[PDB]
Amino acid sequence: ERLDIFGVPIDRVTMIQAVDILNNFLQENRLHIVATPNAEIVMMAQKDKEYMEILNNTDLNVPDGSGIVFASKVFKKPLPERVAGFDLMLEFIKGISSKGVKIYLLGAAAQVAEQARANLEKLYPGVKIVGTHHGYFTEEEENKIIEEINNKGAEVLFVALGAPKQEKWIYKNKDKLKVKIAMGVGGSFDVIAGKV
Numbered sequence: 001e002r003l004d005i006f007g008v009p010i011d012r013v014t015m016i017q018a019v020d021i022l023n024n025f026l027q028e029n030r031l032h033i034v035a036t037p038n039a040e041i042v043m044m045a046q047k048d049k050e051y052m053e054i055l056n057n058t059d060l061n062v063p064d065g066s067g068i069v070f071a072s073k074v075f076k077k078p079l080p081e082r083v084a085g086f087d088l089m090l091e092f093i094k095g096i097s098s099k100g101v102k103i104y105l106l107g108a109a110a111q112v113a114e115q116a117r118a119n120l121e122k123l124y125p126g127v128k129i130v131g132t133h134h135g136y137f138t139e140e141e142e143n144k145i146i147e148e149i150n151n152k153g154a155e156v157l158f159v160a161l162g163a164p165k166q167e168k169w170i171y172k173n174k175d176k177l178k179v180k181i182a183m184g185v186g187g188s189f190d191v192i193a194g195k196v
């Protein structure tokens with residue numbers, strides 16, 4: 001089902017299979033960790049002993065970018081299509097925004113996460129974004145944020161802290177968090193807020 005690229009499992013999925021897998025994940029009552037690796041993450045994975053351990057315990061590693069698909073041309077069944085990890089995030093919010101699935105946005109510089117919430121509520125109307133918080137907090141604050149994420153009954157956590165911080169922060173709190181999908185989506189808040 002998956003492809004071993006220099007230690008990093010990449011699931012052989014299309015945009016639509018990846019959106020379908022993620023929809024079935026919301027139906028299973030456990031934390032799923034989704035990551036979107038590109039060639040640059042796989043190179044990071046070689047120097048970072050811990051990051052590699054993490055990329056092998058995620059529930060879904062979705063191939064981000066055209067470069068990593070190119071590398072797959074060495075394998076027997078190469079990766080089927082160009083998936084952009086940002087497109088995956090947006091096509092995903094399109095589908096759940098009618099069904100009222102609660103989304104929390106943790107990350108980005110001060111007031112950036114709040115602006116991305118606004119533009120999403122327009123593009124995908126009726127989307128339930130239950131909370132946000134900037135990506136610069138303390139160990140004291142972390143407990144407060146996680147408490148909010150859990151108590152507001154968020155099913156989807158979009159962590160925008162960049163690689164590999166986002167994938168590492170999720171894995172540490174993989175037992176504290178009570179959401180169904182926690183997906184590192186680094187820097188896509190900056191894009192949606194129009195800052196970048």
Ligand SMILES: CC(=O)N[C@@H]1[C@@H](OP(=O)(O)OP(=O)(O)OC[C@H]2O[C@@H](n3ccc(=O)[nH]c3=O)[C@H](O)[C@@H]2O)O[C@H](CO)[C@@H](O)[C@@H]1O
Nearest residue numbers: 040041085107108109135136160161162163185186187190
């Ligand atoms: C799609 C994806 O996985 N992209 C990654 C990329 O993301 P990026 O383009 O955003 O690059 P950064 O320079 O790391 O950006 C930092 C972002 O995280 C926020 N942040 C950071 C630190 C913090 O303590 N709190 C925060 O909130 C900040 O506001 C901003 O949104 O980074 C890697 C290296 O470049 C890439 O290899 C990798 O593909």
